[PDB]
C-alpha cells in the first residue's frame, strides 16, 4: 500500500494516524527555557511510531486554512496562501516539512535538515506534539509539523 493523498485523507477524515520512522520534538531546557529541535528514530515494536493525521479547514472569510486541536477555544495552526507557511496565533515553536508524495508507509516524512537525531530512549507521547496536516482539495501538499509543548 502507498500513502497516497487518498490514503492520507482516509486517515484524516477519521482522526486517525500513519506510521513514521522518524518523529520530531522541541526539547526544553528547564534552566533557561530555551528550546531545541531534535528527532528520534521510532520503533514499530514500541508503538510510538504513529503520527496523527488531520484535515485542515478552509476559512474563506479569513482567507486561511486552519486546524483546531482537541478542546481548543481558538485556531491552533494557520496557513494563508498569501505568504504562505505554517503560522500560529501563539508564540510557540514550530518546524515543518512537506511529506514525501505517495511513499512507502513509514517513510513519508523526510528527516529535517540540520536537526540532530538523538539515539536516546523514546520520550513519552506527552512530550510530542506533531501532526500531518492535510489540505481539502490538496490545494497544497500534506505537511508534517511539530510544535513545542502547549
Amino acid at each position: 500500500m502507498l500513502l497516497t493523498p487518498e490514503k492520507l485523507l482516509e486517515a484524516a477524515n477519521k482522526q486517525g494516524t500513519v506510521p513514521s520512522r522518524v518523529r520530531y520534538q522541541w526539547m526544553e531546557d528547564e534552566e533557561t527555557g530555551r528550546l531545541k529541535a531534535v528527532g528520534y528514530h521510532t520503533s514499530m515494536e514500541s508503538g510510538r511510531d504513529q503520527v496523527r493525521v488531520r484535515l485542515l479547514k478552509h476559512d474563506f472569510p479569513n482567507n486561511r486554512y486552519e486546524f483546531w486541536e482537541e478542546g481548543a477555544t481558538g485556531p491552533t495552526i494557520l496557513w494563508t496562501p498569501d505568504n504562505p507557511g505554517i503560522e500560529l496565533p501563539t508564540d510557540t515553536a514550530h518546524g515543518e516539512q512537506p511529506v514525501i508524495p505517495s511513499a512507502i508507509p513509514g517513510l513519508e516524512i523526510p528527516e529535517m535538515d540540520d536537526v540532530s537525531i538523538l539515539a536516546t530512549p523514546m520520550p513519552d507521547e506527552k512530550d510530542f506534539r506533531d501532526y500531518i496536516l492535510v489540505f481539502p482539495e490538496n490545494a497544497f501538499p500534506p505537511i508534517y509539523v511539530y510544535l513545542s509543548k502547549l
Side-chain angles (χ1 to χ4, degrees):
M1 191 203 105
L2 247 41
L3 233 46
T4 67
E6 277 288 73
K7 296 298 186 180
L8 288 169
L9 191 61
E10 184 190 315
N13 285 320
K14 65 172 181 182
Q15 321 284 295
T17 73
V18 294
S20 174
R21 185 162 170 287
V22 66
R23 288 180 73 190
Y24 291 89
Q25 155 195 78
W26 284 95
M27 206 158 58
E28 182 173 301
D29 178 50
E30 200 184 309
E31 293 182 354
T32 71
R34 290 175 70 80
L35 301 175
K36 183 175 182 59
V38 296
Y40 308 84
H41 280 143
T42 69
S43 171
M44 176 206 280
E45 180 77 11
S46 166
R48 219 185 259 52
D49 66 319
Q50 295 299 326
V51 168
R52 298 165 300 176
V53 185
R54 298 288 178 275
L55 177 65
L56 281 162
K57 289 185 174 61
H58 204 324
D59 192 322
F60 300 102
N62 288 299
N63 294 298
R64 312 174 311 186
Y65 284 103
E66 48 182 67
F67 164 60
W68 288 53
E69 287 192 306
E70 282 297 290
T73 47
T76 320
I77 307 179
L78 296 166
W79 178 291
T80 313
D82 284 295
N83 289 46
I86 291 291
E87 301 194 318
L88 284 77
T90 52
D91 197 52
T92 79
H94 65 272
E96 60 278 327
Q97 202 72 295
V99 174
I100 298 180
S102 301
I104 292 297
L107 312 180
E108 76 280 355
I109 299 181
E111 293 184 356
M112 303 304 116
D113 179 66
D114 201 40
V115 177
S116 185
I117 293 177
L118 308 181
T120 178
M122 191 70 50
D124 297 314
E125 191 55 29
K126 292 103 285 300
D127 298 306
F128 278 97
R129 190 187 176 192
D130 57 347
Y131 300 92
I132 276 181
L133 307 183
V134 170
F135 286 83
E137 73 147 14
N138 272 211
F140 291 95
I143 183 161
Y144 173 77
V145 61
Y146 55 101
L147 319 174
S148 50
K149 239 182 177 298
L150 210 177

